Amino acid sequence: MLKYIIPTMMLMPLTWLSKNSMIWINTTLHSLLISLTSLLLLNQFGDNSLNFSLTFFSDSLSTPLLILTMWLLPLMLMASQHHLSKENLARKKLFISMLILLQLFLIMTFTATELIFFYIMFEATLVPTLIIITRWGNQTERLNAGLYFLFYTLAGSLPLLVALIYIQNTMGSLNFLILQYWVQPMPNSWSNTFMWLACMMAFMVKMPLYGLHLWLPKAHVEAPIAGSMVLAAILLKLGGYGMMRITLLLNPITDFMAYPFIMLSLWGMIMTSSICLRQTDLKSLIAYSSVSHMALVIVAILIQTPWSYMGATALMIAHGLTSSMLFCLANSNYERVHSRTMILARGLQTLLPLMAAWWLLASLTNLALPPSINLIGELFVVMSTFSWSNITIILMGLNMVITALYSLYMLITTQRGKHTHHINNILPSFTRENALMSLHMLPLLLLSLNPKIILGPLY
C-alpha cells in the first residue's frame, strides 16, 4: 500500500512548492492521478485477500473504501476553493495539508493488517478533521461542535483501546489475518459482555447510533464543505469497517447482545427520517438522513449474515457518494443565498435548470431508486433483516416510505414552488460546481453497470 502512501506524502512538497496560482491545480491533478492509480487494488481473489505486506492488506471490503477515499480528495479540493478565495496563502496551504494528511491517515486506516494500528490511525484521523472544522468553520459554536467530537470519539474509544490490548495479551496477536484462524468463540459472561461493549461502542458512536447521533447535525452545520464531504463519505464508514472487522472476535455473544442496539437502530431509522420531515435547516436534513442510512448499516452488521454484509458495504459506498453530493449541493446554494435555511431559497429550477437535474439525481439516489447501488444495498439489508425476523419488514418499508417523503420534500422545497422575490444574488451555475456534482454522480451511476466490486469480501 506503499505505492499510495508515498504519492500522498509527495503531495506535501507538491502543495508547499507550487506558485500562488498553481496550488489548487497541481494538487487536483496529482490527486486525480492517485485516484486513477487506486484502481490497481481491484486485484481481488475469490478466496485469498490481497495481502501486500506485514503492515498492509486489502480484501474486498477495504478496497472500495480506499477507492472512495482517494477519489474524494480531488472532489474536496474542487469544493473547498471558492470559499478560500479570500483566504491567506499559507492558511490555504495548511488547509490542503490537513486534507492530504487526512487522506494519508485514511488510506492506511483501512489497510491496517493489525488492529492497534487500526486504532492509532482510527483515532489519528480526528485531528486533521478537527482542525478543518474548528478552523475553517462558520459560526460561534464551532468550538463546541469540535469539543464533543473529540470527547465522544475518545470517551468511546477509551474502552476500545483497553479491549484491543486485552486481545493482544490473550490471543497473542492483533493481526486480523492471524485472528481469522485463531479466533475463539466468546462465551456468555458479564466480563465478555463488557468486552463486547468495549469492542463495539466506539464504532457505534462513529456510525452514529440513534441516541448517540447528537454530535453529527451540529458538527456538519459547523463544518466547511470539505469537512462535511469527508465526514459524510469516509469518517462515518470507519465505524462500519471497524464493526465488520471486530465482530469476528465477538461470537456468539453478539447474537443476544445485539438486541438493544438493533432496536435502537431500527426505531432510530424511523425517528431520524421523521426529523428529516420536520427540518428547517438543509444541511441538518442531510445530516439526519445520513444517520437514517447508517442505522441500516448498524442493523446489517449486527445480524451478520452474508446478504447483510454485502448490502451494508454496498450501502456504505453508495451513501458516501450520495451524501457527499447532497452536502455539495447544499454548499452550492449556501454560496449564493449565504444561509442554510431550506425555506429561504425556493423555486430554483426556474433559475438553475441543470443544477436542478443534479438535485433530482441526488434525491433519486437518496430514496434508493433501482437499479442504483443505493437500492442494491437497501434491498439486501431488507432481505437479510426479513430473514432475521419477519416483522422487521414493517419498520423497513415504513422507513423507505418516509425516505421517499423527505427526499422528494427536500427536492420540492428547494427546487420547486414560487421563488423568493427578495433574493437576486443567484448567479448561474459555475463549471466548477457542475463538475463537482458530475464527479459525484457519474461514478455512482457507472457502479450500477458493475456492482460486484462494491459488495465486500463475501460476494
Partner: protein
C-alpha cells in the same frame, strides 16, 4: 638470665607450630546457595525484531 626485649619486639608476628588440626569451617556455615546460570552462546539477532504490536523492525 632473662633479657628484657627491645622496642618493637613484643609486637612482632610470630609463627606457631601446632598439633591440633585446622578448623575447616569455623563459622559453622551451611552450604552456599547455587549461583544463577551465566550467559553463554552467540548473540543472534532478535526473531522478527521488537515484536511490539506491529513494528516490523
Amino acid at each position: 638470665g632473662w633479657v628484657r626485649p627491645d622496642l618493637g619486639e613484643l609486637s612482632k608476628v610470630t609463627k606457631v607450630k601446632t598439633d591440633r588440626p585446622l578448623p575447616e569451617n569455623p563459622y559453622h556455615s551451611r552450604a552456599r546457595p547455587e549461583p544463577n546460570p551465566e550467559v553463554e552462546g552467540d548473540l543472534k539477532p532478535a526473531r522478527h525484531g521488537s515484536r511490539l504490536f506491529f513494528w516490523t523492525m
